[PDB]
Amino acid sequence: AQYEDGKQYTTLEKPVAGAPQVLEFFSFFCPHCYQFEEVLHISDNVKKKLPEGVKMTKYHVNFMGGDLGKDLTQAWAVAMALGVEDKVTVPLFEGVQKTQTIRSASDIRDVFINAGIKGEEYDAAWNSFVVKSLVAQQEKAAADVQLRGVPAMFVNGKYQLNPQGMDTSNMDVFVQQYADTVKYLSEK
Numbered sequence: 582a583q584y585e586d587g588k589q590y591t592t593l594e595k596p597v598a599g600a601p602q603v604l605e606f607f608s609f610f611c612p613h614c615y616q617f618e619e620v621l622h623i624s625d626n627v628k629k630k631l632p633e634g635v636k637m638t639k640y641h642v643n644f645m646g647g648d649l650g651k652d653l654t655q656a657w658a659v660a661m662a663l664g665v666e667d668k669v670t671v672p673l674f675e676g677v678q679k680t681q682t683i684r685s686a687s688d689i690r691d692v693f694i695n696a697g698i699k700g701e702e703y704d705a706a707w708n709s710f711v712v713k714s715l716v717a718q719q720e721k722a723a724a725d726v727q728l729r730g731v732p733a734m735f736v737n738g739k740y741q742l743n744p745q746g747m748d749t750s751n752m753d754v755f756v757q758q759y760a761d762t763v764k765y766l767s768e769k
């Protein structure tokens with residue numbers, strides 16, 4: 582077939598009931614994730630190829646970056662709780678990988694302050710049980726699939742995108758193949 586298990590996608594030997602329709606995992610330490618955000622715009626190009634109103638979910642992971650990796654998962658929980666993901670994603674990626682100015686939880690907080698989140702609101706969220714629950718939710722989603730590596734995308738709790746099997750000579754051809762694969766998997 583044109584789409585084959587092992588080529589554009591793989592199939593989970595233990596499928597995950599109840600998972601979000603489109604679920605992405607990333608780390609602010611991950612070099613491909615940086616490109617998926619700033620240069621390839623993978624999430625938006627997938628969204629535009631799926632029907633209106635489909636749920637897409639994006640979670641951070643702990644396994645890169647030690648202490649700061651876990652701090653970034655908690656900050657991503659804050660960003661989700663406050664609905665400011667679009668305001669902090671690029672400065673967090675650049676602070677971790679480009680300028681390397683993010684070395685502590687305090688440096689992470691500065692990114693939110695610079696983006697216009699008030700300090701009192703950041704701190705209240707950071708320490709809230711709503712955020713502790715969002716951290717647990719991110720861990721649980723990743724654990725369900727013994728998540729190996731990022732960037733990872735899962736479709737309907739059943740299929741995992743395989744970007745290693747896609748074109749790499751042209752950025753836009755790769756993005757197109759990736760998004761068309763998501764569409765194909767969503768229609769299975």
Ligand SMILES: c1cc(-c2ccc(CNC3CCCCC3)cc2)cs1
Binds near residue numbers: 613748750
């Ligand atoms: C987990 C994810 C990956 C991966 C492998 C390949 C890609 C596509 N990157 C290229 C780089 C730029 C030109 C076209 C696409 C993106 C991610 C390897 S391991």
